[PDB]
């Protein structure tokens, strides 16, 4: 509206993904860029050198700007700040060559910036902040404990991967950006609705980050459904990617069904109507951002 512009998703090559999802780009995207800069500067200040890109993407839109385009402008910078730290902390958790000395050495710095993000969120919106802290902690713990599990189906993998990829974490941030809280009743019913959305987000990331994650497998755990399909079905990269592409399309359709099924079995409030809409923008934003984000695409990298 006055906070985001509608963007024609057909102007992008999405490999058949994102059909019937609308795409929006936050008008205050510079605040997301500012949040990511400050987070990266604090990382070098308290942790160590930067070794990768996070949410930044000036071509197709900052991660926060397209994934969360309904965010209130006064909350976009902090959300992007949090996500940028999460982007960088994510690769630390996946690392397999980190010495016990460096892990001890970086523990206090990681703690400081984590506590800095939680404190700022609590000071702005306490109810929303508590959900962010809960999901953030659950994602880190789940990743730490379960990242080495050998899954033998995409279904089993996704129960872990939806948490590892940060889908509830990002949902909690999106609610904070809306200044929105759900009742425990609404929490219960909407959990079933957004499960295929979480899976679409997780598998879409696998699709577009597989090349980069294969490049890092010498030093990082490979958590990717493309690899799983390759092993269990004895397929090469593009054939496995096609199967994941098809699986993404299935989850995308299932999400649209559950949104409309919710609307049928339950006159919804305009709050829940906004919630449903905001969730669909995660799908289109995550998809378009992953197309040429420097994080996964080296010929878009700089500096
Ligand atoms: Mg990860
Ligand atoms: Mg990762
Ligand atoms: Mg990935
Ligand atoms: Na990895």
Author numbering: 5 to 270, 272 to 308
From the manuscript:
Here, we describe the discovery that class I terpene cyclases are bifunctional, in that they catalyze both terpene cyclization and aromatic prenyltransferase reactions in the same active site. Class I terpene cyclases require 3 Mg2+ ions for catalytic function, and these metal ions are coordinated by conserved metal-binding motifs in a unique α-helical protein fold. Interestingly, the diterpene synthase FgGS can accept GPP as substrate donor to produce long-chain prenylindoles 11–14. Compounds 11 and 14 were characterized as previously reported (E)-1-(3,7-dimethylocta-2,6-dien-1-yl)-1H-indole and (E)-3-(3,7-dimethylocta-2,6-dien-1-yl)-1H-indole, respectively. This characterization implies that the active site cavity of FgGS is sufficiently large to allow the binding of indole as well as C5 DMAPP or C10 GPP to produce prenylindoles.
The crystal structure of FgGS complexed with Mg2+3-PPi and imidazole was determined at 2.15 Å resolution. The protein structure in this complex is essentially identical to that in the BTAC complex (rms deviation = 0.15 Å for 292 Cα atoms in monomer A). Metal coordination and hydrogen bond interactions for the PPi group in this complex are identical to those observed in the BTAC complex. Unexpectedly, imidazole and not indole is trapped in the active site of this structure. Imidazole was required for crystallization and the concentrations of imidazole and indole were 50 mM and 1 mM, respectively. Therefore, imidazole out-competed indole for binding in the active site during crystallization. Intermolecular interactions suggest that imidazole is bound as the positively charged imidazolium cation. The imidazolium N2-H group donates a hydrogen bond to the bridging oxygen of PPi, and the imidazolium N1-H group donates a hydrogen bond to a water molecule (monomer A) or ethylene glycol (monomer B). While all side chains of both complexes are in approximately the same position in the active site, R216 of the FgGS–Mg2+3–PPi–imidazole complex in monomer A adopts two conformations.
